[PDB]
Design a binder for this molecule. Structure first.
Ligand SMILES: *[C@@H]1O[C@H](CO)[C@@H](O)[C@H](O)[C@H]1NC(C)=O
Ligand SMILES: *[C@@H]1O[C@H](CO)[C@@H](O)[C@H](O)[C@H]1NC(C)=O
Ligand SMILES: *[C@@H]1O[C@H](CO)[C@@H](O)[C@H](O)[C@H]1NC(C)=O
Ligand SMILES: *[C@@H]1O[C@H](CO)[C@@H](O)[C@H](O)[C@H]1NC(C)=O
Ligand SMILES: *[C@@H]1O[C@H](CO)[C@@H](O)[C@H](O)[C@H]1NC(C)=O
Ligand SMILES: [Ca+2]
Ligand SMILES: [Ca+2]
Ligand SMILES: [Ca+2]
Lengths: 184, 715
C-alpha cells in the first residue's frame, strides 16, 4: 500500500547523445544542430503553451567530439542561455518578475518554474523533472509524456517512426541545418 | 542586440571596427582582419586578402583559423581543414552554409562570419572576446576613437594602421598602398543624402551615425556608378545589427534585386523563414532583421520539394525520405496516417499484441519491453489475470555449465481454469491433456497444425494464438486480439501501451529488473530464483568472438537483406541477442540462426517480406528437410493437402504471420501417407472413402469422377 503522491516525470539527455525520454524510452542520437529537448509549443493551438528547451552539442576546445552542451530555457517571454559553465538572461518580452528561480544544487544549475525544474551538470547532462500537469502536452526529444513509450518517436508531423535518426532530424530548429548521418 | 560586437569590410576598401570607427584602407595583401591575440591560448584567427577584379575591389580569400579548424574561402569554394566540402557543412559547434546571398560560417560561441562572395564581409564576435582581440576590426574595448590608433602613444593614419596589421606569405613580399590623392565628385546629385537621410533608415539615424557612410557613398560615386549601393547595403546591415528596423530602399533603379516567383526581396525580413516542415520556426526566434528572399505572410516555404513558398495546406509531407503530396495517405501495419493540415493525421487500425520468447532467455513483451531472463522453472508467460480463461506457461531450462545458458523446453497452454492443457514440447511433440496428439487437431474451437516443419500453430477462440518455433531451436510467439488490452498479467506484461508498467507485480509496484520481476511469476515455489547476468559470454573465447561478430554483423549491414526492415525495426536488440546467443550457445550456429530467424519473423510480423537472407549461412536448415518437401521463405497459409482439396478444412481458416519453413511445393499435395505427390496421384475422399484419382464410380443413383483430386458427382 503506497501513498498516492504524484511523482515528477523525468527526461534525461546526457553523454554523446543518449536520451531517456519522459515515458521511459531510451535511445541514442548524435546531433550537431539545435534540437528541441522539450516544448509546449506543439498543438492545435501552439500559443496556449508556455516553455521551450533547446540543446546542442558544444565542443569546448575544438570542433570535434562534443565536450559540453548549450541549453536555451525559454519561459513565455523570458529566455535563459546555459553555456560555458553558467547561465545568462536575454529577457526580451514583458519585464515582470522571473517565472523561474535559480539555484546551485551541488554540481548542478537548477532552474525551476514552479512545475518544471531543469538540472544541468554544467558540462553535458540535463535532467528535466516535470509536474504531472504537463502530461501528454509536451513534445521534442523527451517524447510527449503520455505513458506510451512505443510512439515517443513522434516527429514534427507526428508520423511515428521506428528509427532514431529520423526522430532526431525532425526536431532541429533550423531546417537549413544538415541532417545527421548514420551514427557510428 | 549585436550592438558593438560587429566589424565589417565593404565596397572600396571600407573597414568598420567593433566600436564604430570607419576608414578606407586600399591594401592589397593578406591582413589580420581579426585575431584573439591578448590571451594565453588563441581562439580565432580570421584573415582577409583583398584584390582586384578588373578594377572592382573584392575579397579574394578568407582564412579563418579557430580551435584547430582551418577554413579557407576563395574562388567560390570552401576548404575545410584542407579538403573541399559541399555546402552546407556542419559539425559540433561549426556550420558553414550558402544561406541567402552569402557564405556564412558560424562557430558557435566563437564567431559569425558572413562573406557576400565578392566585396562584403562581416564578423560577429562573442562578448567574452572584449579587449583580447587585435586586427583591423579593432580591440573590442568599446571605445572607438581613442585606442585603435595609438601605437606606443603615437596616433596613426588609416594607411599606417592597416599596414601594421599586415602578414606576408612565406615567399611573398607585397608592397603597401601609396596614399590616394585628393578626391572629387562628392554628392552632387544628392543621392547619398536623399537615400540615407530618407524615410527608410529613419530609426537607423537613432542608432548608427551616417556621416562616414555618407562620405563612403560619395567616394564610391567617385568610382564606378553601378557600385554606389554597397554603402547603403552596409548601412542596412549595421542598422539591422544595432537593433533598428531598416525599411525597403531598393527601387528598380537603385541597384534592383530579384528573387524567385513566390519569393520577394526584402530588407529586414525575419531570419527564420517559416517552412511547413517546421511551419512555426518563426515563433520565438531571436535574431534581428536580415535581408534576402522571403515569402508573403501566410504561405510558408516549401523546403521538401522546393516549389517556392506554398500555402500551409498544400505542401507535401515526408516519411522515411518519401515525399507525399497532401491528399495522399499511407497505412502501416498498426496505423494509417494521411498527409493533411501540413501534418500527418494519424489514426490507428486495431493491432493484435505480440509477445515472444526468443533464444530461451530473451522476452519481448506486449509493451515491447525487451528484457533478458535466465531462469530455470516454469513461468506464467501470460494470463488474463482477471480470470483463469487462458494461461500460457513456458518452461525454461538451463542447458549448460553456465547458469545463464537456457533453452525454452515447453509451452503449456492451460485453459478453462486448467481443465484443458495443450503442451507443445521442444521436439515437436504435442500433448493434449497429457496425451500424445498428432497434428492437425480441431476441437473445442482449438486448432493445432503445422504451417511448415519449423512452426506449430495453436489457434484458440478465446483470443490468443500461439505460434511456436522448433527449428533451429525452441522459441515462442503469442498474438492477442487487442480486446484484451490492459487486462493481462504474467511475464509478457499487461498489454496497456506503457513500458513503465510492464514490471507491475501482484503487489502493486513496478519491479526493478528482469529477473527480479520474473521470480514473482514462477509456477513452482521450489524453483530457484533467476539471477541478474552482467558477464557477457562473448568475452570468453576469441574464436567464438570472431565467429559471432562476423555472422551476427549481417544484421546491421545496410547492404544486407535485413536492411529493408532497418527503417522500421531498430535491429540493435536483435544484434545484441545474436551476439549473446552465439557466444553463449554451445551450438553456435543453432542460436545464431535462431536469432536471424527471430529478426526475420518479427519484421515479417510488422509487414516486410525479408527473403534470401541465408546466403552462405544457415543452409544446413535448407538441406535437412523431410524428403519430398522443400524450403519456402514465404509460407503464408495452411499446408495444401489432398484431404483439404477434396473436402475443405477448418485448418486453413486461421490468419497467422507468414513464417518460413519446409512445405510441399505449389501444385503438389501430401496425402494421408504424408508423401508429396501431384494432384493427379492423390485421391478424392467421399464419406472418408479413398476414391482413387481418375476413377468413375456409382453411388446412390449417381455417377462420380475423381479428376485431379477433385470430386464431381452427376445425376
Ligand atoms: C485553436 O485552433 C483551432 C483549430 O485547430 C482554432 O479553431 C481556434 O480558434 C484556435 N484557438 C486559439 C485561441 O488560437
Ligand atoms: C573559380 O573556380 C572555377 C573552377 O571551379 C574557375 O574556373 C574560375 O576561374 C575561378 N574564379 C572565378 C572568379 O570564377
Ligand atoms: C582593456 O585593456 C586595456 C589594456 O591594458 C586595459 O588598460 C583596460 O583596463 C582594459 N579594460 C577593460 C574594460 O577590459
Ligand atoms: C493503404 O494505402 C494504400 C495506398 O493508398 C491503399 O491502396 C490501401 O487500400 C490502404 N489500405 C486499406 C485502405 O486498408
Ligand atoms: C466453442 O466454444 C463454445 C463455448 O465454450 C462451445 O460451446 C463449443 O462447443 C465450441 N466449439 C464450437 C465448434 O463451437
Ligand atoms: Ca508517447
Ligand atoms: Ca578602442
Ligand atoms: Ca504495459
Amino acid at each position: 500500500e503506497c501513498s498516492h503522491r504524484l511523482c515528477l516525470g523525468t527526461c534525461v539527455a546526457y553523454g554523446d547523445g543518449h536520451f531517456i525520454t519522459f515515458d521511459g524510452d531510451r535511445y541514442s542520437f548524435e546531433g550537431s544542430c539545435e534540437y528541441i529537448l522539450a516544448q509546449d509549443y506543439c498543438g492545435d493551438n501552439t500559443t496556449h503553451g508556455t516553455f521551450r528547451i533547446v540543446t546542442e552539442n558544444i565542443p569546448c576546445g575544438t570542433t570535434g567530439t562534443t565536450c559540453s552542451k548549450a541549453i536555451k530555457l525559454f519561459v513565455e517571454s523570458y529566455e535563459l542561455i546555459l553555456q560555458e559553465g553558467t547561465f545568462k538572461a536575454v529577457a526580451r518580452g514583458p519585464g515582470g518578475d522571473p517565472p523561474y528561480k535559480i539555484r546551485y544544487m551541488g554540481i548542478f544549475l537548477v532552474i525551476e518554474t514552479h512545475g518544471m525544474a531543469v538540472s544541468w551538470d554544467r558540462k553535458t547532462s540535463v535532467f528535466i523533472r516535470l509536474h504531472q500537469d504537463y502530461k501528454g502536452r509536451v513534445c521534442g526529444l523527451c517524447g510527449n509524456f503520455d505513458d506510451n513509450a512505443i510512439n515517443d518517436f513522434a516527429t514534427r508531423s507526428r508520423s511515428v517512426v521506428g528509427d532514431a535518426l529520423e526522430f532526431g532530424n525532425s526536431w532541429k530548429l533550423s531546417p537549413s541545418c544538415p541532417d545527421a548521418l548514420a551514427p557510428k | 542586440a549585436h550592438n558593438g560586437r560587429v566589424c565589417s569590410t565593404w565596397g572600396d576598401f571600407h573597414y568598420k571596427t567593433f566600436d564604430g570607427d570607419v576608414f578606407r584602407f586600399p591594401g592589397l595583401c593578406n591582413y589580420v582582419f581579426s585575431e584573439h591575440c591578448r590571451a594565453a591560448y588563441e581562439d580565432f584567427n580570421v584573415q582577409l586578402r583583398r584584390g582586384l577584379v578588373g578594377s572592382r575591389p573584392v575579397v579574394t580569400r578568407v582564412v579563418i583559423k579557430a580551435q584547430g579548424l582551418v577554413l579557407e574561402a576563395s574562388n567560390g569554394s570552401v576548404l575545410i581543414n584542407g579538403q573541399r566540402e559541399e555546402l552546407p557543412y556542419s559539425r559540433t559547434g561549426l556550420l558553414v552554409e550558402q544561406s541567402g546571398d552569402y557564405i556564412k560560417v558560424s562557430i558557435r560561441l566563437v564567431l559569425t562570419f558572413l562573406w557576400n562572395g565578392e566585396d562584403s564581409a562581416l564578423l560577429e564576435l562573442d562578448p567574452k572576446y572584449a579587449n583580447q582581440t587585435c586586427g583591423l576590426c579593432g580591440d573590442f574595448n568599446g571605445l572607438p576613437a581613442f585606442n585603435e590608433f595609438y601605437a606606443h602613444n603615437a596616433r596613426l593614419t588609416p594607411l599606417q594602421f592597416g599596414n601594421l596589421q599586415k602578414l606576408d606569405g612565406p615567399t611573398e613580399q607585397c608592397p603597401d598602398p601609396l596614399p590616394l590623392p585628393a578626391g572629387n565628385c562628392t554628392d552632387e546629385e544628392g543621392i547619398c543624402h536623399r537615400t540615407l537621410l530618407g524615410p527608410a533608415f529613419a530609426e537607423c539615424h537613432a542608432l548608427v551615425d551616417s556621416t562616414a557612410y555618407l562620405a563612403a557613398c560619395a567616394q564610391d560615386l567617385c568610382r564606378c556608378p553601378t557600385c554606389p549601393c554597397a554603402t547603403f547595403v552596409e548601412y542596412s546591415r549595421q542598422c539591422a545589427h544595432a537593433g533598428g528596423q531598416p525599411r525597403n530602399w531598393r527601387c528598380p533603379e537603385l541597384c534592383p534585386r530579384t528573387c524567385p516567383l513566390n519569393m520577394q526581396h526584402q530588407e529586414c525580413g525575419s531570419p527564420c523563414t517559416d517552412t511547413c516542415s517546421n511551419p512555426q520556426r518563426a515563433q520565438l526566434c531571436e535574431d534581428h532583421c536580415v535581408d534576402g528572399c522571403f515569402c508573403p505572410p501566410g504561405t510558408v516555404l516549401d523546403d521538401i520539394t522546393h516549389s517556392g513558398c506554398l500555402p500551409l495546406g498544400q505542401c507535401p509531407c515526408t516519411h522515411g525520405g518519401r515525399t507525399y503530396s497532401p491528399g495522399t495517405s499511407f497505412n502501416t501495419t498498426c496505423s494509417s496516417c494521411t498527409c493533411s493540415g501540413g501534418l500527418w493525421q494519424c489514426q490507428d487500425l486495431p493491432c493484435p499484441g505480440t509477445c515472444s520468447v526468443q533464444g530461451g532467455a530473451h522476452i519481448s513483451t506486449y509493451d515491447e519491453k525487451l528484457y533478458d531472463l535466465h531462469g530455470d522453472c516454469s513461468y506464467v508467460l501470460s494470463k488474463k489475470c482477471a480470470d483463469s480463461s487462458f494461461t500460457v506457461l513456458a518452461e525454461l531450462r538451463k542447458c549448460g555449465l553456465t547458469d545463464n545458458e537456457n533453452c525454452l523446453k515447453a509451452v503449456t497452454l492451460s485453459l478453462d481454469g486448467g481443465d484443458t492443457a495443450i503442451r507443445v514440447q521442444a521436439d515437436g511433440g504435442v500433448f493434449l491433456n497429457s496425451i500424445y496428439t498428432q497434428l492437425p487437431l480441431s476441437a473445442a474451437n482449438i486448432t493445432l497444425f503445422t504451417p511448415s516443419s519449423f512452426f506449430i500453430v495453436v489457434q484458440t477462440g478465446l483470443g490468443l494464438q500461439l505460434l511456436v518455433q522448433l527449428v533451429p531451436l525452441m522459441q515462442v510467439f503469442v498474438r492477442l486480439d487487442p480486446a484484451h488490452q490492459g487486462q493481462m498479467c504474467g511475464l509478457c506484461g499487461n498489454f496497456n501501451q506503457n513500458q513503465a508498467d510492464d514490471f507491475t507485480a501482484l503487489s502493486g509496484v513496478v519491479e526493478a529488473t528482469g529477473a527480479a520481476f520474473a521470480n514473482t511469476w514462477k509456477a513452482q515455489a521450489a524453483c530457484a530464483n533467476a539471477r541478474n547476468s552482467f558477464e557477457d559470454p562473448c568475452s570468453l573465447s576469441v574464436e567464438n568472438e570472431n565467429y559471432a561478430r562476423h555472422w551476427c554483423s549481417r544484421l546491421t549491414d545496410p547492404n544486407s537483406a535485413f536492411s529493408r526492415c532497418h527503417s522500421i525495426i531498430n535491429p540493435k536488440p536483435f544484434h545484441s541477442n545474436c551476439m549473446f546467443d552465439t557466444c553463449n550457445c554451445e551450438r553456435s550456429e543453432d542460436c545464431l540462426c535462431a536469432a536471424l530467424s527471430s529478426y526475420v519473423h518479427a519484421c515479417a510480423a510488422k509487414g516486410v517480406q525479408l527473403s534470401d537472407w541465408r546466403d552462405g549461412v544457415c543452409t544446413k536448415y535448407m538441406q535437412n528437410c523431410p524428403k519430398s518437401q522443400r524450403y519456402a521463405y514465404v509460407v503464408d497459409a495452411c499446408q495444401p493437402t489432398c484431404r483439404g482439396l477434396s473436402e475443405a478444412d477448418v485448418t486453413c481458416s486461421v490468419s497467422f504471420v507468414p513464417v518460413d519453413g519446409c512445405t510441399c511445393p505449389a501444385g503438389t499435395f501430401l496425402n494421408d501417407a504424408g508423401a508429396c505427390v501431384p494432384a493427379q496421384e492423390c485421391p478424392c475422399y467421399a464419406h472418408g472413402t479413398v476414391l482413387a484419382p481418375g476413377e468413375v464410380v456409382h453411388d446412390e443413383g449417381a455417377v462420380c469422377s475423381c479428376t485431379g483430386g477433385k470430386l464431381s458427382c452427376l445425376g
